[PDB]
DNA sequence: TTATGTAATACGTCTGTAACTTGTTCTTATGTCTGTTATGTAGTTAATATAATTGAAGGATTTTAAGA
């Protein structure tokens, strides 16, 4: 229907068009009939009938009248909807600014006319007059006079000059402006200029200019002649049950407008003072702007209840405003909501479903089958059926929901797997029954949580949830690619005592034919679970290259090992099996079946899993009970030794011997030795028992305790747990963050007095409360990144770049922190890899990297490589699948129309909660910085050189001495200065110094044209450089943080590139949570969309001027087809924020924040919107060009190519 | 499901007949977003 | 629905093709080429799929052939 | 053999039912005119009196225009 949504100015003639009538009257409705009257607020004359197709007299009463307009009332009979259409008009008695283009900075009408926003608003508050015809006088337009002044130059001239005072003085200056010659007069100035400051004044000035020039727009239309009024049934008078009546505030303040407006028509008919006249036009000033935007001139006006009375742009912006509350999100129909309980005889697509809510959900659905299979003769007889609860209502309802998926919701929604589609199982009850291993996707536990339910209804819907949404599909997390279904809790406890070994159980040394009799074994009671015997397997191997080798052979196992052995699929080894199953071995074990099987063995394989982890859990029996904490006898010898010696430094600090500072900190290390080896006595009493062999003699076993089991195999507690509960709690620290001096000596089995349970209320308070604003903090993190890069579509397959990023393991010491073979896993190579030390192309150009080549990387000794990135896309729009690569959900390449930027910026978001020189290796040295190098070539140990045992080239030996997680990443995304950043070398040349300024220091460089650059340096920096040394381009000056566009700037895309990943990817790793480099590299180049213009050229820009990076590329491509002079640009960094608000569409930069600046540039400029992105149709109701929508949105570029 | 008035119903007439097909239209909300930033005496209209 | 997307590449587009041979099944008078089972028309549409009886060309084809006819 | 006279049988047909249609005649619902009362609007009052008003409050960070 349409393609585009245009914004502009309202001229008068417009605003008048879209009028169906005057609002004369500031009347709404009569006191006892309760009908509108004419010619006021609520007309229907002006708006439209209020019943029907009736009229207000009631003579015209049928649809055969429509159309008719009734000569007694006026009112055209017609629909009622027409009254949320119809729009009315105000004929203001004097002219009014507008206050969105008056006093939202910087304004319009201000840099317009040149004149300093004081100076309008003195003129606007009827103080002093300006001139607007000069005429043959010295006076100049524009120039304010004075009262007595006016005077004088009134009776000195007389009508031979004009001077007006109020808004239509400014209305006259905006009509007299000559807007293509003031263009040129400031084109020539910028010619002719050189103060900075005084350029970056006439640009704006001059865009606006030529903004305004070429939108068509006049500016005198910045100042209101005719008001317009809102639909009523948008603005409407209610009546509430008891007889009250409800209505908006916009009411209110219409009334104001209305009545003002009318007293000063009635003033200047009773002829009156210019005082009083002056007053009025004040307060019709006033009125409209506290009507169009309520606060920003002043105090806000509030009504009969002590509140400020809400305006039009209260009703378009903010978190309550119609973008975010009805727009991007609304309540919808055929939609449930329940707590949710644990189903564990569940399969993974299943879902329990209360019936109550499955009638209510599937309603429709029900009705046309009961019309179809005929025992409903109509729709009523059909719902009197379904509310009188009949039998065949039931067997109907199993019929519809038979095959047909409903969707599970949990709010916070962090990741796209709170969203999950099921199949429903009917249940009697009234809770939502959950299958277990989804539980960690939706981060969802069995204490009062609740779930929201939505039925899909169109066969596109439903097909999406089978395919796309379905539990089954999404079981590999996308921020990572690994499982996310792993098991947990009692399923890992299960596994794990089913699979543990016991010395001299019964039924030691039996051989069984297989997993099937080492089950009759265990039923019939005569080995037990834990019983070392030898069992014959029979095992296949899958290769890399599908070959099946099946072979038999006798293992020494344990009866439990081969008992889940028989649940596992063919194609896995059996080692995978035979060892003590923790969390980390259940995982690893899904893993390689999802690696060598594919999905549907894997959910098979999940699901049986999980059933028998539940039942050996169960037969387990295990308990917890004060006899389990077993506190080591050492822990009170430990405390008297350490009391002992405190009371020694006590006495030696009584002697002056060491000083406070230096007790309270050994005190400090004293009480954690202390604490740790408490916690090393209380592990090592605890992990172990004595038994008695088969042989007789004594041997060591791993206990059997059950906090120790718990613990040991992942289900539930840690380390720090355990020394809580059965050795020492530790220090703790004072709310300030200072830790107290004496700990807690006791744990929680002997129980804590009254002080040390306060110092620990002091941590549990800054805990929760920590939690609680941390949350809030990630959330709006996530936002910002989601409409940052919420743009980014994959839209073809190969863009043909030969750009590239060079991939290299992470250094960071004498240690690597993460591998290649992590970092290269699904990304396409960019450049051949050729193997080291040979010309041999071990691995072409255009490859994904899976596992198989990862290994063959691993085994070759390869260091660098050059990989495809997001960045370095040449794709006008979004990206393509090569520069992508695999997409971790799913195991591929990655398809056509993914939205890969909500992906990324999920993944960020999501784990924000969690948030708060010795060699070492035997290999060569060689100088950059300090590297040293393995024997295979792999560089091992990167080390900073300040400014050695071995020079370069010379091999070293084994031990040679050769000689805060939240507010970083959000400061970091949003490329921030830091506070004292690091003084970089602008330019590459020798170093010199210069005269010593009063204040702070300058300084010099010598290029190698010889032209001297200056330098602006603090006193207190201390400087690296010397004089006489030439220094290259991207060295440091002075020690400190690294400003990101300084790097950028100086360095290169690469370089920032590589600084965000990594400075991110620190935070993220320091917590313990993998998010691949993809995501970040996809926010990184949605901070590069922008370039200043610095070389003109021939091209339609401006210098200085900050415009689109792919605008730029087009035009400087179309312009190299036609032979002439390109434009020379630098990119810019912009923060998320900063980069959101200056989209190319103002739908979405004015759904995201700052809604009036947005709209207000967007009128002024005359923008256009093209609805290319998620968010324009999402709040239009379109598909959106991404997935499923993607084709059909391509054949719409098709025809309008056509 | 929210608010596409004509859709809405559009929509439960096909699930009473089994069709199981929508015809989308223009939500209420964005008339309504419209018609305040036109009262805002600000041009916003949408092109064919 | 493993091998359904093996059949066609990309999860969207066979969304798209089973969403028209379901509505071909549903509000046309177009019948299955596989045995119903008792299954919604998504899913046989799916099953379709997967057998290789029903593509995105094969469903062009088809409606080209009515057209002509 | 043939007139004669009864008897089966098929076809008109006279009359009794019923459909189509109009007269007209009576009854009632509605639209309209008129008279009366309540409602709604408007104008005037003449010791003298001559700069509101009411709150409200432990914010923490960024970015961006004015002033010097
Ligand atoms: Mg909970
Ligand atoms: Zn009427
Ligand atoms: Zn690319």
């Given at each position: 229907?349409?393609?585009?949504i245009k914004?502009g ?8 068009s879209?009028?169906?009538?005057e ?7 009569n006191?006892?009939?309760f ?7 609520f ?9 029907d ?20 009332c006026?009112?055209?009979?017609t ?13 203001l008695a ?9 006093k939202?900075?910087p304004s319009?009408?201000g840099?317009?006319?040149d004149?300093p ?9 009827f103080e002093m007059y300006?001139?607007?015809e000069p ?26 000059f004009?001077?007006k ?10 009509a ?5 010659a ?14 900075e400051?005084?350029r ?12 305004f ?14 008001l ?8 409407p008078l209610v ?8 209505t908006?505030?916009?009411?209110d ?10 007293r000063?028509k ?19 000033q006033?009125?409209?702007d ?6 920003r ?8 209840n ?15 405003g ?11 129909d ?41 025992l409903?003769?109509?729709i ?9 609860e009949?039998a065949?209502?039931?067997d ?6 038979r ?7 949990r709010?916070?929604?962090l ?5 999950q ?8 009850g ?6 277990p ?7 969802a ?11 899909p209804?169109?066969?596109e ?6 395919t796309?949404?379905m539990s ?11 499982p ?24 030691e040394?039996m051989?069984?034919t297989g ?6 074994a265990?039923?019939?009671?005569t ?5 070392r ?9 899958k ?6 080798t099946?072979?038999?052979?006798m ?22 099996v ?5 969390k980390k071995?259940?995982?690893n074990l899904?893993?390689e079946?999802?690696r ?8 098979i394989?999940?699901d049986?899993?999980?059933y ?9 029996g ?11 006898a ?9 009391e002992?010696e ?5 006495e ?8 406070a500072?230096?007790?309270?900190n050994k ?5 954690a030795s ?9 592990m ?5 028992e004595?038994?008695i062999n ?8 791993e206990?059997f305790n059950?906090?120790?089991?718990m ?7 840690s ?12 220090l703790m ?7 107290i001096?004496?700990?807690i000596?006791?744990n929680?089995?002997e129980?804590?007095?009254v ?6 209320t ?8 920590d ?8 959330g ?14 994959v ?11 060079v991939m290299?393991?992470?250094?960071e ?13 699904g990304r396409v ?7 080291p ?21 691993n085994?070759?000794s ?5 990989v ?12 393509c699948?090569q ?10 390449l990655?398809?056509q129309?993914?939205?890969v930027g909500?992906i ?5 978001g999501?784990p924000?909660?969690?948030?708060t ?16 190098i393995?024997?295979?070539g792999?560089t091992?140990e ?9 020079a ?8 040679e ?17 830091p ?10 040349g020798?170093?010199?110094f ?14 190698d044209?010889?032209?001297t650059?200056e ?11 010397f ?14 943080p690294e400003?990101?566009h ?6 290169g895309?690469?370089a ?5 990943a990594?400075?991110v ?10 998010i691949?480099?993809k995501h ?9 969309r922008?370039?200043?213009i610095?070389f ?12 689109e ?7 400087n491509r ?10 020379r ?5 912009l923060g ?11 739908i979405?930069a ?6 009036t ?5 967007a ?11 998620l968010k ?5 109701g379109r ?8 084709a ?5 570029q098709?025809?309008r190519?056509? | ?9 559009k ?5 009473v ?10 939500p ?21 | 629905?493993?091998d359904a ?17 379901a ?7 177009k019948?299955?080429?596989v ?12 099953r379709?799929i ?15 052939q009515?057209?002509?006819?």
């Amino acid at each position: 229907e349409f393609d585009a949504i245009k914004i502009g100015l309202a001229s008068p003639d417009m605003i008048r068009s879209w009028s169906f009538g005057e609002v004369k009257k500031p009347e709404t409705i009569n006191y006892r009939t309760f009908k509108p009257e004419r010619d006021g607020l609520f007309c229907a004359r002006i708006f439209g009938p209020v019943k029907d197709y009736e009229c207000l007299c009631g003579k015209y009463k049928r649809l055969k009248h429509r159309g008719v307009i009734c000569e007694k009332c006026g009112v055209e009979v017609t629909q009622t909807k027409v009254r949320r259409d119809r729009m009315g008009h105000i004929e203001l008695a004097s002219p009014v600014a507008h206050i969105w283009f008056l006093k939202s900075l910087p304004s319009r009408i201000g840099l317009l006319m040149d004149m300093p926003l004081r100076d309008i608003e003195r003129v606007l508050y009827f103080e002093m007059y300006v001139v607007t015809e000069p005429g043959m006088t010295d006076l100049e337009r524009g120039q304010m006079l004075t009262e007595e002044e006016y005077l004088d130059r009134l009776e000195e001239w007389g009508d031979e000059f004009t001077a007006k005072m109020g808004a239509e003085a400014i209305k006259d200056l905006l009509a007299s402006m000559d807007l293509p010659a003031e263009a040129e007069q400031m084109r020539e100035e910028l010619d002719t200029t050189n103060s900075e400051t005084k350029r970056k004044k006439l640009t704006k000035r001059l865009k606006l200019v030529e903004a305004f020039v070429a939108s068509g727009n006049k500016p005198e239309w910045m100042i209101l002649t005719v008001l317009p009024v809102l639909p009523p049934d948008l603005r409407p008078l209610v009546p509430l049950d008891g007889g009250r009546f409800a209505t908006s505030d916009l009411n209110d303040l219409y009334r104001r407008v209305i009545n003002r407006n009318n007293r000063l028509k009635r003033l200047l008919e009773l002829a009156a003072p210019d005082i009083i006249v002056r007053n009025e036009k004040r307060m019709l000033q006033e009125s409209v702007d506290a009507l169009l935007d309520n606060g920003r001139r002043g105090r806000a006006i509030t009504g009969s209840n002590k509140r400020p009375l809400k305006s039009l742009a209260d009703m378009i912006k903010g978190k309550q405003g119609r973008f975010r509350q009805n727009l991007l999100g609304k309540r919808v129909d055929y939609s449930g909501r329940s707590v949710i309980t644990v189903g564990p005889y569940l399969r993974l697509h299943q879902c329990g479903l209360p019936k109550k809510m499955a009638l209510e959900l599937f309603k429709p659905f029900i009705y046309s089958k009961l019309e179809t299979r005929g025992l409903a003769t109509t729709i009523k007889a059909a719902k009197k059926m379904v509310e009188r609860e009949e039998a065949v209502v039931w067997d109907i309802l199993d019929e519809v929901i038979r095959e047909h998926p409903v969707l599970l919701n949990r709010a916070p929604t962090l990741h796209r797997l709170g969203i999950q589609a099921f199949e429903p199982v009917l249940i009697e009850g009234k809770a939502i029954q959950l299958h277990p291993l989804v539980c960690a996707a939706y981060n969802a536990d069995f204490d009062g949580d609740q779930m929201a339910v939505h039925v899909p209804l169109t066969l596109e819907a439903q097909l999406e949830a089978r395919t796309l949404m379905m539990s089954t599909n999404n079981i590999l997390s996308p921020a990572s690619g690994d499982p996310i279904i792993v098991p947990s809790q009692d399923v890992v406890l299960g596994l794990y005592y089913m699979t543990r070994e016991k010395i001299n159980a019964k039924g030691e040394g039996m051989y069984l034919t297989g997993p099937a009799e080492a089950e009759k074994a265990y039923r019939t009671k005569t080995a037990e679970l834990h019983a070392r015997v030898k069992v014959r397997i029979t095992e296949t191997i899958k290769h890399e290259n599908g070959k099946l080798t099946t072979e038999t052979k006798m293992i020494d196992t344990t009866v439990g090992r081969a008992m889940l052995w028989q649940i596992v699929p063919k194609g896995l080894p059996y080692s995978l099996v035979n060892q003590k199953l923790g969390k980390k071995q259940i995982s690893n074990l899904l893993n390689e079946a999802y690696r060598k099987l594919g999905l549907k063995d894997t959910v098979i394989f999940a699901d049986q899993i999980m059933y028998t982890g539940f039942a050996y859990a169960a037969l387990s029996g295990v308990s917890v009970g004060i006899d389990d904490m077993v506190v080591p006898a050492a822990k009170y010898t430990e405390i008297a030794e350490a009391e002992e010696e405190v009371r020694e430094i006590q006495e030696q600090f009584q002697s002056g011997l060491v000083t406070a500072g230096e007790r309270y900190n050994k005190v400090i290390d004293i009480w954690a030795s202390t604490n740790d080896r408490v916690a090393k006595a209380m592990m090592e009493n605890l992990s172990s028992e004595q038994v008695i062999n088969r042989q007789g003699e004594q041997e060591k076993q791993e206990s059997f305790n059950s906090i120790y089991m718990m613990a040991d195999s992942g289900a539930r507690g840690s380390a720090a747990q355990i020394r809580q509960l059965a050795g020492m709690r530790g220090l703790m620290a004072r709310p300030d963050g200072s830790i107290i001096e004496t700990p807690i000596t006791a744990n929680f089995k002997e129980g804590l007095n009254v002080l040390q349970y306060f110092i620990s209320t002091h941590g549990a308070r800054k805990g929760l409360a920590d939690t609680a604003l941390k949350t809030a903090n990630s959330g709006y993190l996530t936002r910002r990144l989601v409409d940052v890069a919420q743009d980014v579509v994959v839209t073809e397959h190969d863009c043909g770049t030969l750009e590239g990023v060079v991939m290299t393991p992470h250094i960071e010491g004498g240690d690597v922190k993460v591998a290649l073979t992590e970092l290269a896993l699904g990304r396409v190579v960019s450049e051949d890899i050729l193997k080291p030390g040979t010309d041999e192309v071990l691995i072409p150009r255009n490859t994904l990297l899976d596992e198989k080549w990862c290994k063959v990387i691993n085994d070759n000794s390869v260091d660098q490589i050059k990989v495809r990135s997001v960045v370095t896309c040449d794709s006008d729009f979004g990206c393509c699948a090569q520069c992508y690569g695999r997409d971790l959900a799913r195991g591929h390449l990655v398809n056509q129309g993914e939205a890969v930027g909500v992906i990324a910026a999920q993944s960020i978001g999501e784990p924000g909660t969690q948030l708060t020189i010795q060699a070492k290796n035997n290999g060569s040295v060689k100088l950059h910085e300090l590297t040293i190098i393995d024997e295979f070539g792999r560089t091992k140990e990167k080390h900073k050189l300040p400014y050695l045992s071995k020079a370069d080239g010379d091999a070293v030996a084994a031990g040679e001495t050769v000689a805060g997680g939240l507010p970083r990443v959000a400061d970091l995304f949003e490329a921030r200065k830091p506070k004292e950043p690091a003084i970089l070398a602008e330019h590459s040349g020798t170093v010199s110094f210069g005269k010593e300024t009063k204040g702070k220091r300058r300084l010099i460089i010598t290029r190698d044209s010889g032209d001297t650059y200056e330098e602006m340096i603090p006193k207190h920096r201390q400087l690296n450089v010397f004089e006489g040394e030439r220094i290259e381009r991207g060295d440091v000056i002075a020690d400190g943080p690294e400003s990101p566009h300084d790097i950028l700037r100086l360095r290169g895309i690469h370089a920032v590139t590589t600084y965000i990943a990594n400075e991110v990817q620190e935070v993220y790793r320091l917590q313990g949570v993998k998010i691949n480099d993809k995501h970040i590299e996809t926010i990184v180049r949605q901070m590069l969309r922008k370039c200043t213009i610095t070389f003109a050229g021939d091209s339609e820009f401006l210098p200085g001027e900050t415009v689109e990076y792919s605008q730029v590329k087009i035009a400087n491509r179309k312009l190299v087809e036609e032979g002439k002079e390109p434009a020379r640009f630098e990119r810019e960094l912009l923060g998320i924020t900063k980069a959101s608000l200056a989209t190319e569409s103002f739908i979405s930069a004015a759904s995201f924040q700052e809604t009036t600046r947005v709209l207000t540039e967007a009128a002024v400029s005359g923008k256009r919107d093209d609805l290319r992105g998620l968010k324009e149709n999402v709040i239009v109701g379109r598909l959106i060009p991404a997935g499923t929508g993607f084709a059909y949105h391509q054949d719409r570029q098709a025809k309008r190519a056509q | 499901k929210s608010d596409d008035v004509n859709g809405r119903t559009k929509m439960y007439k096909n699930i009473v007949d089994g069709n199981h097909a929508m015809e989308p239209g223009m939500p209420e909300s964005f008339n309504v977003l419209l018609k305040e930033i036109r009262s805002l005496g600000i041009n916003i209209e949408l092109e064919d | 629905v493993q091998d359904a997307v093996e059949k066609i590449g990309n999860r969207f587009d066979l969304v798209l093709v089973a969403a028209r041979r379901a509505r071909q099944m549903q509000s046309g008078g177009k019948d299955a080429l596989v045995p119903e089972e008792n299954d919604k028309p998504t899913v046989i549409a799916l099953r379709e799929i997967e057998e290789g009886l029903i593509t995105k060309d094969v469903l062009d084809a088809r409606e080209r052939q009515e057209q002509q006819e």
